[PDB]
Amino acid sequence: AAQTNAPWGLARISSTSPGTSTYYYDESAGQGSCVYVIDTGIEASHPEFEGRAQMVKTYYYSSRDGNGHGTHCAGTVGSRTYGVAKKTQLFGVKVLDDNGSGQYSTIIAGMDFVASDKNNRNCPKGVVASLSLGGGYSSSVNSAAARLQSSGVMVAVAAGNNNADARNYSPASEPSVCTVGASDRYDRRSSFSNYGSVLDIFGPGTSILSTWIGGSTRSISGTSMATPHVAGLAAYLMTLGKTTAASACRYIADTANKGDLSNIPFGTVNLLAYNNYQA
């Protein structure tokens, strides 16, 4: 299946090379897999989610995404136009308030909620979690991402937008999860992207067009937008029976476009998330 004049990020993850604008992907499109977006929530009622999105848990007055971040990250995961996995189920978990911040205790509850809640959802194809959030190192948060991962959920976390080594950010520094750096359309590492041995993969991160609240659309940059891409890709690859939750990260890193990116620090992996789809 080809989606012409697709956002550059989608087009790129179906491409050996930059500069193309068609997104190629198996028409299965992550159907029957579930991506839990742990973020500010999801405007489920956005025409772009086609009913496939729902808020499953909040730690605040409203499960409504007043911020947008989560709706935008959910969009890049499984929105019809902007999503990688156009047929995946998206499960909003609002750990972040409408100011886009959240206590580490809350976030941890959210990761643990998903580990359990997946046993309450139909995901024959397998479960993904897209942690487009981060902050200072915290072994507690790291352990929570590890647990989620262990629980049989592919976890994709942002490296962080600090242009520093991601060893010093959580859950970015957790070994067991898929730490995602960000690239731009010209295959450069996004200026803001965190790096370091801990990173597993890059994903489109700069000027990522995706769904926004008030049923709208807008481009925003950040490793936070790379992550949904890779989460999405994991949902697409699990539905194709090409990988499992446990090994998805490895499988994405094996099948990635190698050496393509410029401005990658020595000892950071030069791997760009590829769907490795042949039409």
Chain contacts with Ca ion (rule: CB under 5 A):
7-8, 69, 72-73, 209, 224
> Does the annotation mark 229 as catalytic?
no
Q: Can you read off the two tokens belonging to residue 22?
A: 């068609």
| CB of residue 228 to Ca ion, shortest distance in Å | 7
> Does the annotation mark 39 as catalytic?
yes
For Ca ion, the closer CB: 7 or 83: 7
Distance between CA atoms of residues 77 and 236, nearest Å: 10
| Residue 260 in marked binding region | yes
Residue with token string 């978990």? 93
For Ca ion, the closer CB: 146 or 156: 156
Distance between CA atoms of residues 166 and 170, nearest Å: 8
From 69, 97, 130, 165, the catalytic residue: 69
From 14, 130, 193, 224, the catalytic residue: 224
| Residue 141 in marked binding region | no
Total Cβ atoms within 10 A of residue 279: 9
Q: Which residues contact 160 (CB under 8 A, 6 or more apart)?
A: 134, 135, 166, 169, 172, 194, 223
Q: One-letter amino acid identity for 75?
A: G
For Ca ion, the closer CB: 219 or 244: 219
| CB of residue 73 to Ca ion, shortest distance in Å | 4
| CB of residue 39 to Ca ion, shortest distance in Å | 7
- Phi/psi of residue 28, nearest 5 degrees: -55, -50
β-strand partners of 126 = 33
| CB of residue 109 to Ca ion, shortest distance in Å | 21
Q: Which residues contact 100 (CB under 8 A, 6 or more apart)?
A: 40, 67, 69
| Residue 16 in marked binding region | yes
For Ca ion, the closer CB: 67 or 149: 67
Total Cβ atoms within 10 A of residue 135: 16
For Ca ion, the closer CB: 72 or 147: 72
| Residue 254 in marked binding region | no
Q: One-letter amino acid identity for 227?
A: T
| CB of residue 9 to Ca ion, shortest distance in Å | 7
SS3 of 83, please? coil
Determine contact, residues 97/61, Cβ cutoff 8 Å: no
User: What are the Cα distances from residue 174, in Å, to 57, 91, 141, 145, 269?
Assistant: 24, 23, 8, 7, 16
Give binding residues as ranges. Answer: 16, 175, 177, 200, 260
Give binding residues for Ca(2+) as ranges. Answer: 16, 175, 177, 200, 260
Residues serving a catalytic function are 39, 69, 224
